[PDB]
């Protein structure tokens, strides 16, 4: 059963918020961290920067930039956060791309309304070349920029916590059937869902030796959160027919 | 923005250095900027404690940013104060920039403690040789207080200042003032804040020198500030300092 790729995780974190921190170079080559807001143009952060802000000047002088993005978290342990560095090169777009970048920024950051059309604020789009993902504790990987651009953000992740808890609170019995008949543990006595994404559900199952982890895939990947309902109903039905 | 109807004696306001120190102390997460070994700017999520204003990091020697620091110890960190406001541009933020150094001896032990106190899970990493303690020697500061003021400061000014003991812990107090002391806030606006024509007053900030008030006046919405009778230095002193404010407001 397929799992989101690092590229997908990265896209998903990017799409989870509109704030991060840009790293740029001063003219002397010192590393400069700046708070920034952004929208996305197919996975690409779109910044609206004042030309006299330190980071606007940095980009104009050396357009190498990276942005670290942190997914909003329920967990109060910061080290459990899901986070990503998108690194490459920022460029001021033109023409059609500029108009689309502008729009994407505007609908992700309402207040940019008041800045984006002054001639002394510029729109930058970060051409992502490299990606480093850290998915909380002990999950990490790198990807290429092309893999990142090819991937899609997960439409289930943003509302997964609620879905997960609802499944555990009200569907423990269906979760158990899935584990027994689809997940490879016919004798487990208890199954808890520990994650949901567009490909399937992760299950923690009781064994005589502790717990095991299995995964059950939907009939096929889903494309919106509203399809999760039908996907779990089909999972429960397929489990009874085994 | 309508002006005060009457003059008020200037109220002490935290300095940019103090604001910067206060933002730093408001949380234990930020983002480090370092140089890769090929000179690219690298942004990393990090956790930190403070040693007299100085971020203390605990970094894996095999993490990209650990390897960056070992090679070139120039670093900066951006820190964003936790906010109620959902408009990110209203956020208070700061960049602390300088040079990171692995401390030794007494300083290392104090750095270690400070990091541990601020980040519970660092418990499981900080004594292992794979992880190093770094302290950021702050040389310059850029502060952006929301839509409000912005300014730069020197590292010495930053080191000399103190974090506000009230502001980071004021959310409950602020809300209690707004929910239960509308009358007192109103009287302060009218009699001490320069806006006798205030009809409603809301406290939008509290710090160790005084309270910021947003006022609904017959002429529209305005902003003022009222100062304690003297600065305070601990949160438990806030109640008594706001009571004296209310009393001074009734006495004209
Ligand atoms: Mg321009
Ligand atoms: Ni249900
Ligand atoms: Ni009170």
Resolution of the structure in the document, Å: 2.2
Cα distance between residue B85 and residue A49, in whole Å: 21
- Quick one: three-class SS letters along B1-45? CCCCCCCCCCCCCCCHHHHHHHHHHCCCEEEEEEECCCCCEEEEE
- Residue pointed to by tokens 């998903």: A12
> What are the chain B neighbours of A31 within 8 Å (beta carbons)?
33-35, 41-42, 74-76
* Residue A173 DSSP SS3: helix
Of B42, B75, B91, the CB nearest to A85: B42
* Burial of A118: CB neighbours in 10 Å, binned 0-12, 13-18, 19+: exposed
Cα distance between residue B11 and residue B209, in whole Å: 8
Q: Do B95 and B183 fall within a single domain?
A: no
Cα distance between residue B54 and residue B103, in whole Å: 12
Cα distance between residue B142 and residue B169, in whole Å: 23
Q: Do B103 and B200 fall within a single domain?
A: no
Experimental method: X-ray
- Ligand 2 midpoint to CA A223 (Å): 20
Element (H, E) at A227: helix A227-240
Q: Do B16 and B136 fall within a single domain?
A: yes
Q: Do A144 and A154 fall within a single domain?
A: no
DSSP A153: -
Q: Are A32 and A23 in contact (CB under 8 A)?
A: yes
CA distances from A105 to A15, A148, B78 (A): 12, 19, 22
- The whole-angstrom distance between residue B83's C-alpha and the CA centroid of its chain comes to 11
Last residue of a domain, one of A97, A128, A149: A149
Angle of the B182-191 helix axis to the B171-180 helix axis, nearest 10: 90
- Burial code (b: 16+ CB inside 10 Å, e: under 16) for A86-108 equals bbbbbbebeeebeeebbebbbeb
Q: Do A37 and A8 fall within a single domain?
A: yes
Residues 159-188 of B with CB under 8 A from A: none
Q: What is the CATH number of the domain that holds A205?
A: 3.20.180.10
Of A19, A32, A134, the CB nearest to B97: A32
CA atoms within 13 A on the CB side of A207: 10
What is the C-alpha radius of gyration for chain A, rounded to an integer number of angstroms?
A: 21
Q: Do B41 and B82 fall within a single domain?
A: yes
Cα distance between residue A237 and residue A241, in whole Å: 7
Q: Across chain B, which distance is largest between two alpha carbons, in Å?
A: 67
Element (H, E) at A144: strand A140-144
Q: What is the CATH number of the domain that holds B64?
A: 2.30.110.10
Q: How many domains does chain A have?
A: 2
Q: Do B109 and B11 fall within a single domain?
A: yes
Residues ≥6 apart with Cβ < 8 Å to A122 = A48, A49, A51, A56, A92
- The whole domain housing A4 covers 1-149
* Burial of B195: CB neighbours in 10 Å, binned 0-12, 13-18, 19+: buried
Work out whether strand B220-227 and strand B210-217 pair parallel, antiparallel, or are unpaired.
Answer: antiparallel
The CA angle A160-B89-B228, to the nearest 5 degrees, is: 115
In this complex, is the C-beta atom of B30 within 8 Å of any C-beta atom belonging to chain A? Answer: yes
Residues 47-76 of A with CB under 8 A from B: 54, 64-68, 70
DSSP A188-213: -S-EEEEEE-SSEEEEEEEETTEEEE
- CB atoms A32 and B76 under 8 Å: yes
CA proximity to A31, closest of B66, B72, B250: B72
Q: Are A81 and A52 in contact (CB under 8 A)?
A: no
Q: Do A93 and A129 fall within a single domain?
A: yes
Extract the tokens encoding B8.
Answer: 């008020």
- CB atoms B29 and A70 under 8 Å: yes
> What are the chain B neighbours of A87 within 8 Å (beta carbons)?
40, 42-43
Length of chain B: 252
- Residue pointed to by tokens 């990110």: B88
Of B44, B45, B80, the CB nearest to A35: B80
- Ligand 1 midpoint to CA A93 (Å): 11
Cα distance between residue B208 and residue B204, in whole Å: 14
- Quick one: three-class SS letters along chain B? CCCCCCCCCCCCCCCHHHHHHHHHHCCCEEEEEEECCCCCEEEEEEECEEECCEEEEEEECCCHHHHHHHHCCEEEEEEECCCCCCCHHHCEEEEEEEEEECCCHHHHHHHHHHHHHHCHHHHHCCCCCCEEEEEEEEEEEEEEECCCCEEEEEHHHHHHCCCCCCHHHCHHHHHHHHHHCHHHHHHHHHHCCCCCCEEEEEEEEECCCEEEEEEEECCEEEEEEEECCCCCCCHHHHHHHHHHHHHHHHCC
DSSP A27: T
Which chain A residue is nearest to residue B44, measuring alpha carbons?
A68
Cα distance between residue B181 and residue A22, in whole Å: 42
Q: Do B206 and B247 fall within a single domain?
A: yes
Residues ≥6 apart with Cβ < 8 Å to A241 = none
Cα distance between residue A69 and residue B53, in whole Å: 25
- CB atoms A30 and B78 under 8 Å: no
Q: Are A202 and A215 in contact (CB under 8 A)?
A: yes
Q: Are A125 and A91 in contact (CB under 8 A)?
A: yes
Q: Do B66 and B176 fall within a single domain?
A: no
Number of A/B CB contacts below 8 angstroms equals 104
Residues ≥6 apart with Cβ < 8 Å to B230 = none
Extract the tokens encoding A229.
Answer: 């309902």
Extract the tokens encoding B102.
Answer: 């692995």
Last residue of a domain, one of A149, A179, A206: A149
Which chain A residue is nearest to residue B92, measuring alpha carbons?
A35
- The whole-angstrom distance between residue B238's C-alpha and the CA centroid of its chain comes to 17
Q: Do A133 and A181 fall within a single domain?
A: no
Cα distance between residue B51 and residue B114, in whole Å: 6
DSSP A183: S
Residues 135-164 of B with CB under 8 A from A: 142, 144
DSSP A30: -
Last residue of a domain, one of A149, A165, A189: A149
CA distances from B208 to A162, B227, B230 (A): 40, 9, 9
Of B40, B75, B121, the CB nearest to A64: B40
Angle of the A172-181 helix axis to the A227-240 helix axis, nearest 10: 60
The CA angle B147-B152-B153, to the nearest 5 degrees, is: 135
Extract the tokens encoding A7.
Answer: 């590229």
B78/chain A closest Cα distance in angstroms: 5
The CA angle B22-B28-B30, to the nearest 5 degrees, is: 90
* Residue A62 DSSP SS3: coil
Phi, psi of A133 (to 5 degrees): -115, 135
Cα distance between residue A232 and residue A110, in whole Å: 35
- Quick one: three-class SS letters along A69-113? EECCCCCCCHHHCEEEEEEEEEECCCHHHHHHHHHHHHHHCHHHH
Q: Do A133 and A203 fall within a single domain?
A: no
Q: Which of B24, B27, B31, B134 to mutate to test the interface with A (most CBs of A within 10 A)?
A: B31
Angle of the B182-191 helix axis to the B238-250 helix axis, nearest 10: 60
CA proximity to A46, closest of A122, A117, A110, A120: A122
- Pick left, alpha or beta for residue A119 (phi over 0 → left; psi -120 to 50 → alpha; otherwise beta): alpha
């Amino acid at each position: 059963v397929v799992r989101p790729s690092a590229a997908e995780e990265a896209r998903t974190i990017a799409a989870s918020t509109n704030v991060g921190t840009l790293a740029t170079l001063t003219t002397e080559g010192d590393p400069w961290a700046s708070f920034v807001t952004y929208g996305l143009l197919g996975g690409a952060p779109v910044l609206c920067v004042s030309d006299m802000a330190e980071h606007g000047r940095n980009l104009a002088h050396d357009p190498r930039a990276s942005i670290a993005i942190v997914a909003p978290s329920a967990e109060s342990d910061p080290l459990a956060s899901a986070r990503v560095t998108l690194a490459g090169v920022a460029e001021r777009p033109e023409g059609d791309e500029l108009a689309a970048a502008r729009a994407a920024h505007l609908d992700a950051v309402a207040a940019a309304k008041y800045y984006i059309d002054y001639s002394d604020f510029s729109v930058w789009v970060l051409r992502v070349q490299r990606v480093r993902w850290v998915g909380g504790y002990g999950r990490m990987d790198s990807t290429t920029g092309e893999a990142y651009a090819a991937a899609e953000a997960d439409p289930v992740t943003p509302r997964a916590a609620g879905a997960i808890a609802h499944l555990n609170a009200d569907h423990a019995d269906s979760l158990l059937a899935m584990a027994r008949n689809l997940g490879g543990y016919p004798d487990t006595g208890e199954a808890v869902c520990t994650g949901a994404d567009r490909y399937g559900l992760d299950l923690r199952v009781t064994t005589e030796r502790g717990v095991a982890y299995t995964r059950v895939g939907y009939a096929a990947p889903i494309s919106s959160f509203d399809q999760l309902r039908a996907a779990t109903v089909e999972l429960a039905q397929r489990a009874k027919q085994s």
